[PDB]
């Protein structure tokens, strides 16, 4: 009765190009008259190694950049680098691009996954930016360029667009000006994420969404300090909750009638002696992909 | 691995307003035609026993007021079938994708986009339960919002939502307006029957998960299909069918792993729990992927 829901992607599909360069294929975002794409584009096998990106591109030419929109060639007149993402300046502007801009997100935060192949959407799912600033993302071969995304009213905030793929699995990309999120580059090189941690406040906020919508039991009457909670925090390593984050739930303390500090003696107890055979919101484990915000907008219907 | 909903946009540009007495809901205009709840037509007193033929012929074109964004599209008629009101309207929607209706069975998925006062709101993956209700997550006014696959370019509209059982699950028509299920629109009290775990699914999420890299869960043990069945139903699953068995061949080839001795690794996973590990991301074992879903997924 609580579900992962993701933004409606209709704006962002309508931006989704296909972006060729030799014997690679993977998306590009088309907004006004740039398409933005992963700079590693331009690699071949011999150059992902350790690759000199500004000599890559001086020897590549406009021609070399085959961008597709549906079936409909787009010819590029331009392109250059910022950071590690590549603008290719095209002849036409998007006559779909909508109000947008590019934010960068904290970890912590969710945003929605457009994944693309060929330049074509084909699913639609909601992340979370992990503390050790790596998601936990589903992406095949050729997904390189798929965006992540939240929508405030009609304004689309880009955060995110992927570039590759850690040997543990998890996934890592850059924002749309092209920083990476987490200490990680563009090589085809030895990389580690470092170890992750839970994100506290999104799962205290998926407590209260629990109790809004008729599970009870994990509730106790003790409270608890937040001195107190963190040492058992950094024992399974939960991320240590700070005075804002006591505020930020705030708004759902109230409408429930718990306050935080309770909240996290329930939520002490599910770390010492588990749920003691339980489920919560049809989970068996403590779900941390869900803000104060997102409970709340889903509890109330923007 | 991720509950993976469908790109939403070619069904946001179908979504409307409907506006009949006090009552706002949800409407799919496809072509000159906007489907929504015939229910939108009841007032406070007519929820209990509504006479729908009654309630629809005392009914004038004006007393619909639709709305696509901020313009108004005029009713030109309206006619009734089975549960679902069918409003012709003089505009056809230029956004019309191409599309179809299909009633689905059992243990098939589909996204739902949620919406509200005609505007979308989120979009989720689904399925239908065996007990012919879907686990949703629905507020007041959005009836009206589809359930729907899309292939290719084309839509295939499998769901229209209609109400809230006491258990918190929801129920809900085709779009011929056939209910799913044994279930009514009046409120009067209605059953939910019980409910089961789909078994097809969960052993298509098992190859799933034998596909992206774990092996723990497995033994050396096979079984029959009917000693299977004597065990997997003490635990509230659905019997396997032969069907069922012919459906997870072709993830049966690509794995190596025997349909029935995965039947075998199910039969102890029930018997043992987790015993503290996870199996793609989740702690219990999950039966709202199908064969198809785990294929498109995973390749
Ligand atoms: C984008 O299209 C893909 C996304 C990959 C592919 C499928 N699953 C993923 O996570 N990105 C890549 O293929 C990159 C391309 C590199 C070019 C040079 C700069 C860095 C990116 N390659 C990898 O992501 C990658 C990961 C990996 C882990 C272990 C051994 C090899 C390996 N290659
Ligand atoms: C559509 O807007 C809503 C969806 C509900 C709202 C809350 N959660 C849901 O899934 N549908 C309704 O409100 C219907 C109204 C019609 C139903 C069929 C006959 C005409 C009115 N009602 C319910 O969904 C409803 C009422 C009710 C009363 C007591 C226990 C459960 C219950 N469910």
Known sequence: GFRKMAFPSGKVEG??????????????????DVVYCPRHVICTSEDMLNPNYEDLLIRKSNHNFLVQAGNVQLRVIGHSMQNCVLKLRVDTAN?????????????????????????????????????????????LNGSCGSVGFNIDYDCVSFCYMHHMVLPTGVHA???????????????????????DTTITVNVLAWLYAAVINGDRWFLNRFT????????????????????????????????????????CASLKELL???????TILGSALLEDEFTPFDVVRQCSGV
Request: with cysteine; proline share 6%.
């Open 272 to 278: 010492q002696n588990g749920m003691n055979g339980r």
């Open 95 to 139: 006559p779909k691009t909508p109000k947008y801009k590019f934010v960068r997100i904290q970890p912590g935060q969710t945003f929605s996954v457009l994944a693309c192949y060929n330049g074509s959407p084909s699913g639609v799912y909601q992340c979370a930016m992990r503390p050790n600033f790596t998601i936990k993302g589903s992406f």
């Open 173 to 195: 990309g850059t924002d749309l000006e092209g920083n990476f999120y987490g200490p990680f580059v563009d090589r085809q090189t030895a990389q580690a994420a470092g170890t």
């Open 224 to 263: 608890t300090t937040l001195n107190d909670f963190n040492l058992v925090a950094m024992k399974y390593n939960y991320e240590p909750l700070t005075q804002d984050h006591v505020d930020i739930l705030g708004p759902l303390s109230a409408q429930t009638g718990i306050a935080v500090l309770d909240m």
């Open 15 to 32: 931006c989704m190009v296909q972006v060729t360069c030799g014997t690679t294929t993977l998306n590009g975002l088309w907004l006004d």
